[PDB]
Amino acid sequence: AQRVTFRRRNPYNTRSNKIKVVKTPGGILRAQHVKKLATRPKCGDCGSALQGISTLRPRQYATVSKTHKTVSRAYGGSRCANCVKERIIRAFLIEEQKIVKKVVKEQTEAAK
Amino acid sequence: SINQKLALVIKSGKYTLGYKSTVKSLRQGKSKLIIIAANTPVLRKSELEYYAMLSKTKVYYFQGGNNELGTAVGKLFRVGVVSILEAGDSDILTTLA
Amino acid sequence: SLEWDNLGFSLLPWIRTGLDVMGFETMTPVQASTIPMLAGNKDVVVDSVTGSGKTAAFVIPVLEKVVKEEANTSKFKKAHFHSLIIAPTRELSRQIESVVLSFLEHYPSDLFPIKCQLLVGTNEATVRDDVSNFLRNRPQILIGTPGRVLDFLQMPAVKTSACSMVVMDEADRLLDMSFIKDTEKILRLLPKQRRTGLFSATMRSAGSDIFKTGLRNPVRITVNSSSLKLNYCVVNPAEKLQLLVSILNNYKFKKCIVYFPTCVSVSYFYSFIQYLGKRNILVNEVEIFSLHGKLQTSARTKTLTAFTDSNSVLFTTDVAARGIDIPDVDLVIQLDPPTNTDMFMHRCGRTGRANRVGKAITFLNEGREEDFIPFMQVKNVELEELDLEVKGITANFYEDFRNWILEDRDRFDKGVKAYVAFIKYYSNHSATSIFRLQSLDYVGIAKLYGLFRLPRMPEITKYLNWLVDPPVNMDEYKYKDKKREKERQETLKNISLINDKKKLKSELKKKNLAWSDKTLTKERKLERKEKMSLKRKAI
Amino acid sequence: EEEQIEKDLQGLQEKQRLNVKRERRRKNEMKQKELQRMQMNM
Amino acid sequence: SKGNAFKHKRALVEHIIQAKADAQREKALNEEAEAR
Numbered sequence: 001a002q003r004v005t006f007r008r009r010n011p012y013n014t015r016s017n018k019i020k021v022v023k024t025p026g027g028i029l030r031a032q033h034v035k036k037l038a039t040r041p042k043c044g045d046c047g048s049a050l051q052g053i054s055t056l057r058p059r060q061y062a063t064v065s066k067t068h069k070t071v072s073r074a075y076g077g078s079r080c081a082n083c084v085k086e087r088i089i090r091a092f093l094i095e096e097q098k099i100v101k102k103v104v105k106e107q108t109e110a111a112k
Numbered sequence: 113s114i115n116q117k118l119a120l121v122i123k124s125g126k127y128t129l130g131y132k133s134t135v136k137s138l139r140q141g142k143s144k145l146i147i148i149a150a151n152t153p154v155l156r157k158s159e160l161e162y163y164a165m166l167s168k169t170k171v172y173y174f175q176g177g178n179n180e181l182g183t184a185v186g187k188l189f190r191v192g193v194v195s196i197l198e199a200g201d202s203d204i205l206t207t208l209a
Numbered sequence: 210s211l212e213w214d215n216l217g218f219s220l221l222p223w224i225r226t227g228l229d230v231m232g233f234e235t236m237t238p239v240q241a242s243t244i245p246m247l248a249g250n251k252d253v254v255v256d257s258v259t260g261s262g263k264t265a266a267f268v269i270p271v272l273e274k275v276v277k278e279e280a281n282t283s284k285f286k287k288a289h290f291h292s293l294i295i296a297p298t299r300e301l302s303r304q305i306e307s308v309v310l311s312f313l314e315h316y317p318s319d320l321f322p323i324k325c326q327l328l329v330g331t332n333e334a335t336v337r338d339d340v341s342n343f344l345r346n347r348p349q350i351l352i353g354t355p356g357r358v359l360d361f362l363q364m365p366a367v368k369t370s371a372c373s374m375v376v377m378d379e380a381d382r383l384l385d386m387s388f389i390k391d392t393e394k395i396l397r398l399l400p401k402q403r404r405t406g407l408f409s410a411t412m413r414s415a416g417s418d419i420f421k422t423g424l425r426n427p428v429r430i431t432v433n434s435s436s437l438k439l440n441y442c443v444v445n446p447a448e449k450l451q452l453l454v455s456i457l458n459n460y461k462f463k464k465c466i467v468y469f470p471t472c473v474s475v476s477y478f479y480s481f482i483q484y485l486g487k488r489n490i491l492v493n494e495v496e497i498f499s500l501h502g503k504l505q506t507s508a509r510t511k512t513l514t515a516f517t518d519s520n521s522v523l524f525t526t527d528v529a530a531r532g533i534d535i536p537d538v539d540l541v542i543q544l545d546p547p548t549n550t551d552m553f554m555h556r557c558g559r560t561g562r563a564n565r566v567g568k569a570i571t572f573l574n575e576g577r578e579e580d581f582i583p584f585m586q587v588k589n590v591e592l593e594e595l596d597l598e599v600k601g602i603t604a605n606f607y608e609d610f611r612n613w614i615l616e617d618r619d620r621f622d623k624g625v626k627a628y629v630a631f632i633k634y635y636s637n638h639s640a641t642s643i644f645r646l647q648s649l650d651y652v653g654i655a656k657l658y659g660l661f662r663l664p665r666m667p668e669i670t671k672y673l674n675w676l677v678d679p680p681v682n683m684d685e686y687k688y689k690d691k692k693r694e695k696e697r698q699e700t701l702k703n704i705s706l707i708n709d710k711k712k713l714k715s716e717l718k719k720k721n722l723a724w725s726d727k728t729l730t731k732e733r734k735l736e737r738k739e740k741m742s743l744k745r746k747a748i
Numbered sequence: 749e750e751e752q753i754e755k756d757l758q759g760l761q762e763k764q765r766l767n768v769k770r771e772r773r774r775k776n777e778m779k780q781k782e783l784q785r786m787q788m789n790m
Numbered sequence: 791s792k793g794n795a796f797k798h799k800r801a802l803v804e805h806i807i808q809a810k811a812d813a814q815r816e817k818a819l820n821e822e823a824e825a826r
């Protein structure tokens with residue numbers, strides 16, 4: 001039933017300073033400031049959370065290996081699997097349509 | 113009509129409803145005709161068109177949405193594409209439809 | 210026209226050759242109206258009388274579809290099948306398989322063969338043997354009962370994707386409440402786009418349940434035409450077995466089929482009638498067999514083939530009632546009316562083939578017999594009353610049964626078990642008004658089975674002891690079997706220990722009931738008030 | 749004795765009639781509901 | 791049960807068993823009624 005308060009300069013209940021109450025090895029209750037939770041990286045096309053990539057603070061990514069923040073597939077770590085599949089299919093079909101349109105133009109200009 | 117032929121095919125013939133089944137049957141070469149609803153997404157429609165060109169399967173563009181095509185087939189759910197494995201008793205294949 | 214040559218689709222030459230060698234001299238209306246459509250992209254629902262060519266009517270289109278869809282070729286895959294056939298009993302499925310084999314006898318050589326496999330519950334072949342020889346032999350036709358075919362299809366080694374033909378014989382029985390659980394799974398495994406043929410002599414009864422099978426393009430077919438006699442006797446239950454005897458040694462027949470409600474009753478009464486025949490109670494050239502459906506499959510097959518092969522009496526349950534055809538059967542006796550009336554027409558339907566002179570007899574309990582006859586009349590069945598004298602019983606028959614029971618305690622156990630099983634069977638009876646548990650002659654039925662004490666049942670306690678006035682103690686009753694005699698004596702020596710185990714169980718059940726502490730409190734209050742009034746009123 | 753038979757036959761017949769009525773009602777309601785739902789997507 | 795047809799466990803169990811009994815009886819109910 002012991003009351004605890006902030007341990008830093010800020011006296012206001014702002015998002016920046018949030019308090020948890022913990023029992024120290026001295027048998028007493030004491031406050032502890034909690035950091036902001038990390039946010040999962042999101043896909044750049046659909047905005048869904050990327051799978052297989054660890055969730056860390058922006059500056060904590062500078063200290064981990066590349067396998068913990070990428071995926072072995074192309075666009076891995078930036079776009080998800082379904083978006084890459086759509087990109088591949090769309091690019092191939094667009095190229096095929098360009099070929100067909102070029103053949104049609106060649107035929108229609110071949111009359112004269 | 114075209115709805116009567118489709119209903120007869122579902123009653124007596126062999127069919128596959130849906131995009132995945134249609135593509136699988138196109139790969140296996142067992143499709144005689146693919147009816148495509150007008151409500152289908154453009155990417156899937158273009159993929160089906162390319163697959164039909166590869167497999168030399170006749171294409172019929174249904175004049176209605178996936179729900180109208182589902183009702184024409186006789187099912188209370190939407191179907192986006194139908195593939196006719198066997199006409200059976202009907203004559204949809206004979207009349208170039 | 211009823212000519213094979215002028216049918217729509219010009220049946221295959223080898224099927225025609227098989228038909229001609231078998232004969233039939235023509236095609237029946239069922240085969241004339243079903244074969245053109247069941248092979249023509251239409252599901253089939255066929256109701257027809259017994260022995261009207263129905264089996265060939267659904268076998269010929271099966272072979273036609275098998276040949277048509279290139280099932281008999283090297284292109285056909287392994288672990289796949291084409292057509293399935295389901296029947297409610299093992300003998301019916303084996304008979305269907307025999308018909309298919311007879312048709313395939315004349316199948317030409319120099320081509321990829323067409324084979325069939327029978328999947329029934331047997332003690333001579335596990336399901337893994339069925340899978341092994343299915344993989345090795347590669348058939349295109351499967352024939353079997355729902356349980357073993359369900360077990361077979363559930364095995365991962367069998368693929369059902371190429372099936373295109375399902376046939377259900379006795380489809381009203383396979384869509385029954387008991388069989389619907391298995392057939393739903395069996396049809397769930399198989400592909401939906403297929404051709405279904407339902408065939409049953411009472412297909413109208415399964416009214417709206419036919420669409421549970423998954424018909425796509427169906428056409429219902431009804432075929433209609435004194436062939437046989439339908440009688441009934443209204444007698445006291447305790448005399449019923451005696452009346453049976455008075456029919457067996459007096460009537461004129463080549464084969465008599467006697468139906469019993471339960472399997473234990475079949476065995477028990479078979480043994481007692483054999484004992485009576487040992488004493489020469491009935492003197493005739495009669496050979497008596499028993500055949501119920503709880504036997505091992507090999508024993509059932511052997512008994513059926515011995516009976517089918519000289520004057521014979523069969524004590525059978527409802528396994529033999531439907532489908533199977535034993536020629537030269539003259540007399541059919543239903544010792545009790547069936548649990549469901551729909552099967553009644555089947556039980557007495559084993560006779561009357563080609564308007565043969567055959568008789569069916571039924572027995573009634575004298576209490577609510579006024580309701581069974583009009584019930585059949587509304588269903589367009591007329592039962593002419595028959596009067597039969599109870600010959601040979603003055604006073605001794607029940608005494609003879611009782612003193613034969615006293616020889617072996619196994620006989621006592623079998624009799625009491627059969628009586629209790631019959632009581633449960635009567636509990637599960639349709640047409641509740643006609644067959645009432647309250648109006649049941651419990652003492653009469655117990656007298657019929659030779660028992661000398663009413664088993665403890667809720668029915669006996671509520672709606673209604675020692676039948677023999679000088680009681681007999683069970684302590685001096687000897688089991689007559691050496692292995693179980695010592696077990697009985699050990700249990701007798703442990704009477705108090707088992708009694709105390711049950712007492713502790715009863716107390717623990719008391720303490721675990723709904724709000725038991727409150728119940729004990731209420732009993733305390735009631736007991737105190739009642740025991741106070743028990744003296745305050747007197748003083 | 750027979751009063752129970754009369755009562756349960758009458759009760760089961762009334763239950764059957766109510767079941768038929770409610771099945772007809774629900775069938776009409778769901779057919780209209782699915783028609784409207786199918787048409788609302790356009 | 792989502793529509794508050796059952797108020798506790800025993801009610802649900804009794805409803806299930808009564809439904810089984812009625813699903814056994816309805817087929818013969820009509821002919822029994824016609825018989826009387």
Ligand SMILES: [Zn+2]
Pocket residue numbers: 043044045046047048079080081082083
């Ligand atoms: Zn994405």
